[PDB]
Amino acid sequence: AEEFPVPNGFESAYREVDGVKLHYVKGGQGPLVMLVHGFGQTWYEWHQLMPELAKRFTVIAPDLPGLGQSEPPKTGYSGEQVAVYLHKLARQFSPDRPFDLVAHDIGIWNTYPMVVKNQADIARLVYMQAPIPDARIYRFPAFTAQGESLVWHFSFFAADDRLAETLIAGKERFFLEHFIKSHASNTEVFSERLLDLYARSYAKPHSLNASFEYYRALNESVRQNAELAKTRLQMPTMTLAGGGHGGMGTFQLEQMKAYAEDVEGHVLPGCGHWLPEECAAPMNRLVIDFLSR
Amino acid sequence: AEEFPVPNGFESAYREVDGVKLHYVKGGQGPLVMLVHGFGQTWYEWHQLMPELAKRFTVIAPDLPGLGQSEPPKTGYSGEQVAVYLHKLARQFSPDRPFDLVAHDIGIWNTYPMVVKNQADIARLVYMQAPIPDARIYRFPAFTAQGESLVWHFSFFAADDRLAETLIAGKERFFLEHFIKSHASNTEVFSERLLDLYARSYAKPHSLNASFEYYRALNESVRQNAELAKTRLQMPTMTLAGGGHGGMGTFQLEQMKAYAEDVEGHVLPGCGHWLPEECAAPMNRLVIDFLSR
């Protein structure tokens, strides 16, 4: 039973890591690239990029703990805790060579600690569309004069009393369409069919709760990263951000310059938060070219 | 039937203003003081202050258009539109003399335009616990190192797709208790019964919608006030703010100094946003004494 259709030539499988059963989709041959999805989505956001990368890489796309078809974490949802699971998963398939990493949104939060703590294991790194958790996140506005505040949902999702889960239960499909489209420039790619698929996955009660536990751990992740960031990343890095409605704009690269020695950045015009779907052709080209150097 | 218990010696009544049926509670004798409530509440937040004020003043506490037992506005929910209704209601009862004005939270938004445009009609002014809509509101953070921020709700309530009505319907009591307690220093003053009374009022479908339409008009109110603020306020003014969790702290007075030539302010320690309930006795004392000079 699969929540999303697997591309031709790929397999849906599971690996137990530190007592947690992680779901992933895998295909291809060659050095390993791990693609890590974000909030509201699953491995499936990568399904157009995966067959292209599989022509020269082994490609693995896991579901984050608690999301998609992956069990919730047993330790916790802070970035350092979740990163252990993802690092060990990748090293099962690449135990003796560094691997590449591509991450979107909270995929960044959930991988940055294992990148900085295991730099020799990461050949090349691509981060898109979310801040690394640090004190910069406290400077984003609650309310804007034009457009909409990008990250007021941080407070909504992190609020006590299970506020978000209690309000959104029974309205998951409605909420997700609003959240996705309100963070998009090219909204037309989010067909009702595609939104149905994503909503069915995150409406599983444990997945709805898991979604917001990542935000309830955000301040802990900030505190973790304040110590970790005393060592800059040394491997080649690329940032991508949308330049349209919902995009991080220049923030993505400007923040990454404080974390990485070797960073190139791109802002994609007419594209919001959901780069793999809103702007597949330019995003896939940028990622394939950067990893193929 | 009344949504809230009327104090002895007071009358619950209605007046048509520009085709809109406004509810109010009125008592006392002497010059007029109008008390204007805010979001999540109704005239009833003033019910402890009203009998004390009525010893020296005629006191009127209206329900904002669309809230409590008042009909929704027929023009709109921007500050300049709503202020017309409240100004004309006050002038029905005080046609020959200036009146005093006390306002809390969005009661400020809904009165500032008629104060600045009809200064000879306003004897003394008391504002508590919310910014006047202007560019300062764009500086409040979306998220804090302690968790959810003070005014992320501005964006939640202003969002389209009837986001707030759709998520809060069926959970109106749950949401309002969370909203009140997250903006309170002293949660003990809110009995389960008081929360039930407020929740059943704003759960009326047109009142749930009206609540958030004030926020959907907030940026329009900011733009209106950019022009209105070219004229400073000349009447004696007092600001009050909570010094505890949920309070505006020094912001209330510091902002008001930009609007008013003659202003005094107080910050109440141990109190958050809900001053008439969290800190009834000192709030009542400061208002009575300021108006009785």
Short mmCIF file of all heavy atoms in Angstrom, two decimals, chain A residues 3-31:
data_model
loop_
_atom_site.label_atom_id
_atom_site.label_comp_id
_atom_site.label_asym_id
_atom_site.label_seq_id
_atom_site.Cartn_x
_atom_site.Cartn_y
_atom_site.Cartn_z
N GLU A 3 1.23 5.50 -0.54
CA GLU A 3 0.51 6.77 -0.55
C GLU A 3 0.71 7.54 -1.85
O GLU A 3 -0.15 8.35 -2.21
CB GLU A 3 0.95 7.62 0.64
CG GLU A 3 0.53 7.06 1.98
CD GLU A 3 0.91 7.95 3.15
OE1 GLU A 3 1.91 8.70 3.05
OE2 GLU A 3 0.20 7.90 4.17
N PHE A 4 1.82 7.32 -2.55
CA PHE A 4 2.15 8.03 -3.78
C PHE A 4 2.74 7.06 -4.80
O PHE A 4 3.42 6.10 -4.42
CB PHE A 4 3.15 9.18 -3.52
CG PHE A 4 2.71 10.12 -2.46
CD1 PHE A 4 2.96 9.85 -1.12
CD2 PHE A 4 2.06 11.30 -2.79
CE1 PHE A 4 2.54 10.72 -0.12
CE2 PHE A 4 1.64 12.18 -1.81
CZ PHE A 4 1.88 11.88 -0.46
N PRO A 5 2.49 7.29 -6.09
CA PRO A 5 3.00 6.37 -7.11
C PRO A 5 4.52 6.45 -7.25
O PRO A 5 5.09 7.53 -7.34
CB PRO A 5 2.29 6.83 -8.40
CG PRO A 5 1.93 8.25 -8.15
CD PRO A 5 1.70 8.40 -6.66
N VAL A 6 5.15 5.28 -7.26
CA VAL A 6 6.60 5.17 -7.38
C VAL A 6 6.98 5.32 -8.85
O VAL A 6 6.30 4.75 -9.72
CB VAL A 6 7.08 3.84 -6.78
CG1 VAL A 6 8.57 3.66 -6.97
CG2 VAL A 6 6.70 3.76 -5.31
N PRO A 7 8.03 6.07 -9.19
CA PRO A 7 8.43 6.17 -10.59
C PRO A 7 8.91 4.83 -11.12
O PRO A 7 9.35 3.95 -10.37
CB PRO A 7 9.57 7.20 -10.57
CG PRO A 7 9.46 7.89 -9.26
CD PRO A 7 8.89 6.88 -8.31
N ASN A 8 8.81 4.67 -12.43
CA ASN A 8 9.30 3.46 -13.07
C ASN A 8 10.77 3.25 -12.73
O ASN A 8 11.56 4.19 -12.76
CB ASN A 8 9.10 3.54 -14.58
CG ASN A 8 9.33 2.20 -15.26
OD1 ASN A 8 8.39 1.44 -15.48
ND2 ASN A 8 10.59 1.91 -15.60
N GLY A 9 11.12 2.02 -12.37
CA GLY A 9 12.50 1.71 -12.05
C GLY A 9 12.92 2.02 -10.63
O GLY A 9 14.09 1.81 -10.28
N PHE A 10 12.02 2.52 -9.80
CA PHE A 10 12.31 2.77 -8.40
C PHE A 10 11.56 1.76 -7.53
O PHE A 10 10.58 1.15 -7.97
CB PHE A 10 11.92 4.20 -8.01
CG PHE A 10 12.87 5.25 -8.54
CD1 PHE A 10 12.92 5.53 -9.90
CD2 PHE A 10 13.71 5.94 -7.68
CE1 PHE A 10 13.79 6.50 -10.39
CE2 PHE A 10 14.58 6.90 -8.17
CZ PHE A 10 14.62 7.18 -9.53
N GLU A 11 12.03 1.60 -6.30
CA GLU A 11 11.38 0.72 -5.34
C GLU A 11 10.98 1.51 -4.11
O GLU A 11 11.69 2.43 -3.68
CB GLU A 11 12.28 -0.44 -4.92
CG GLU A 11 13.61 0.00 -4.32
CD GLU A 11 14.34 -1.12 -3.60
OE1 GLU A 11 13.75 -2.21 -3.43
OE2 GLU A 11 15.51 -0.92 -3.21
N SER A 12 9.83 1.15 -3.55
CA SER A 12 9.41 1.60 -2.23
C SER A 12 9.84 0.56 -1.20
O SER A 12 9.55 -0.63 -1.35
CB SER A 12 7.90 1.80 -2.19
OG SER A 12 7.42 2.03 -0.87
N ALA A 13 10.55 1.00 -0.16
CA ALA A 13 11.09 0.07 0.83
C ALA A 13 11.18 0.77 2.19
O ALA A 13 10.87 1.96 2.32
CB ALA A 13 12.45 -0.46 0.39
N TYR A 14 11.60 0.01 3.20
CA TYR A 14 11.70 0.49 4.57
C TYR A 14 13.01 0.02 5.18
O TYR A 14 13.51 -1.07 4.86
CB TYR A 14 10.54 0.00 5.45
CG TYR A 14 9.17 0.41 4.97
CD1 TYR A 14 8.52 -0.30 3.97
CD2 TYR A 14 8.53 1.51 5.53
CE1 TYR A 14 7.27 0.07 3.53
CE2 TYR A 14 7.27 1.88 5.10
CZ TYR A 14 6.65 1.16 4.10
OH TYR A 14 5.39 1.54 3.67
N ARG A 15 13.57 0.85 6.05
CA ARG A 15 14.76 0.47 6.81
C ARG A 15 14.57 0.89 8.25
O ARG A 15 14.25 2.06 8.53
CB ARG A 15 16.02 1.12 6.21
CG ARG A 15 17.34 0.66 6.82
CD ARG A 15 17.82 -0.61 6.15
NE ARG A 15 19.23 -0.89 6.43
CZ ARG A 15 19.89 -1.91 5.92
NH1 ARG A 15 19.27 -2.75 5.10
NH2 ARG A 15 21.17 -2.11 6.22
N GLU A 16 14.73 -0.06 9.17
CA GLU A 16 14.71 0.24 10.60
C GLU A 16 16.03 0.90 10.98
O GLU A 16 17.11 0.34 10.74
CB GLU A 16 14.50 -1.04 11.40
CG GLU A 16 14.09 -0.82 12.83
CD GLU A 16 12.60 -0.61 12.96
OE1 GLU A 16 11.90 -0.68 11.93
OE2 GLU A 16 12.13 -0.37 14.09
N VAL A 17 15.95 2.08 11.59
CA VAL A 17 17.13 2.84 12.01
C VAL A 17 16.89 3.27 13.44
O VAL A 17 15.93 3.99 13.72
CB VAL A 17 17.39 4.05 11.10
CG1 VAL A 17 18.59 4.84 11.59
CG2 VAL A 17 17.59 3.60 9.65
N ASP A 18 17.74 2.81 14.36
CA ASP A 18 17.60 3.09 15.79
C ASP A 18 16.16 2.88 16.25
O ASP A 18 15.57 3.72 16.92
CB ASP A 18 18.07 4.51 16.12
CG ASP A 18 19.56 4.71 15.93
OD1 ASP A 18 20.29 3.71 15.72
OD2 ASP A 18 20.01 5.87 16.02
N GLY A 19 15.59 1.74 15.86
CA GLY A 19 14.26 1.35 16.27
C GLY A 19 13.11 2.04 15.57
O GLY A 19 11.95 1.81 15.94
N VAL A 20 13.39 2.87 14.57
CA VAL A 20 12.36 3.62 13.86
C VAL A 20 12.33 3.13 12.42
O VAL A 20 13.36 3.15 11.74
CB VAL A 20 12.63 5.14 13.93
CG1 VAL A 20 11.65 5.91 13.05
CG2 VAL A 20 12.53 5.62 15.37
N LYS A 21 11.16 2.73 11.95
CA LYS A 21 11.03 2.22 10.58
C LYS A 21 10.85 3.39 9.62
O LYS A 21 9.79 4.04 9.62
CB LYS A 21 9.86 1.24 10.48
CG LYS A 21 9.73 0.57 9.12
CD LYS A 21 8.61 -0.45 9.11
CE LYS A 21 8.82 -1.51 10.18
NZ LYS A 21 10.12 -2.22 10.03
N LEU A 22 11.86 3.67 8.81
CA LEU A 22 11.81 4.77 7.84
C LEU A 22 11.41 4.25 6.46
O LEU A 22 11.95 3.25 5.99
CB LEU A 22 13.17 5.46 7.74
CG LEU A 22 13.73 6.08 9.02
CD1 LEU A 22 15.12 6.65 8.74
CD2 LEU A 22 12.80 7.15 9.53
N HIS A 23 10.47 4.95 5.82
CA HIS A 23 10.11 4.65 4.44
C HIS A 23 10.99 5.45 3.50
O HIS A 23 11.33 6.61 3.78
CB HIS A 23 8.64 5.00 4.19
CG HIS A 23 8.22 4.83 2.76
ND1 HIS A 23 7.75 5.88 1.98
CD2 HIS A 23 8.23 3.74 1.95
CE1 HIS A 23 7.48 5.43 0.77
NE2 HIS A 23 7.76 4.14 0.72
N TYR A 24 11.36 4.85 2.37
CA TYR A 24 12.09 5.60 1.36
C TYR A 24 11.77 5.03 -0.02
O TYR A 24 11.28 3.90 -0.15
CB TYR A 24 13.60 5.55 1.59
CG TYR A 24 14.16 4.15 1.54
CD1 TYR A 24 14.65 3.61 0.35
CD2 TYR A 24 14.18 3.36 2.68
CE1 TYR A 24 15.15 2.31 0.31
CE2 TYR A 24 14.68 2.08 2.65
CZ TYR A 24 15.16 1.56 1.47
OH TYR A 24 15.66 0.27 1.44
N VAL A 25 12.08 5.82 -1.04
CA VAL A 25 11.99 5.38 -2.43
C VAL A 25 13.39 5.49 -3.03
O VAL A 25 14.08 6.50 -2.82
CB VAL A 25 10.96 6.22 -3.22
CG1 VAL A 25 10.94 5.80 -4.69
CG2 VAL A 25 9.57 6.03 -2.62
N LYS A 26 13.81 4.45 -3.75
CA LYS A 26 15.20 4.33 -4.17
C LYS A 26 15.28 3.84 -5.61
O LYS A 26 14.51 2.96 -6.02
CB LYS A 26 15.97 3.36 -3.26
CG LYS A 26 17.43 3.11 -3.65
CD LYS A 26 18.09 2.21 -2.63
CE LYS A 26 19.54 1.91 -2.97
NZ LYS A 26 19.66 1.17 -4.25
N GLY A 27 16.20 4.42 -6.37
CA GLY A 27 16.48 3.91 -7.70
C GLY A 27 17.82 4.43 -8.18
O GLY A 27 18.44 5.28 -7.55
N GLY A 28 18.26 3.89 -9.32
CA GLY A 28 19.48 4.36 -9.93
C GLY A 28 20.72 3.60 -9.50
O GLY A 28 20.68 2.66 -8.69
N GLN A 29 21.85 4.03 -10.06
CA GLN A 29 23.14 3.41 -9.81
C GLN A 29 24.20 4.50 -9.77
O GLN A 29 24.08 5.53 -10.44
CB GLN A 29 23.48 2.35 -10.89
CG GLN A 29 24.61 1.41 -10.52
CD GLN A 29 25.04 0.52 -11.67
OE1 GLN A 29 24.35 0.44 -12.69
NE2 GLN A 29 26.18 -0.14 -11.51
N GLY A 30 25.24 4.26 -8.98
CA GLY A 30 26.30 5.23 -8.83
C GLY A 30 26.36 5.81 -7.43
O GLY A 30 25.74 5.29 -6.49
N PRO A 31 27.10 6.90 -7.27
CA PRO A 31 27.21 7.53 -5.94
C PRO A 31 25.84 7.98 -5.46
O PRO A 31 24.95 8.27 -6.26
CB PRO A 31 28.15 8.72 -6.18
CG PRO A 31 28.79 8.48 -7.52
CD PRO A 31 27.81 7.67 -8.31
#
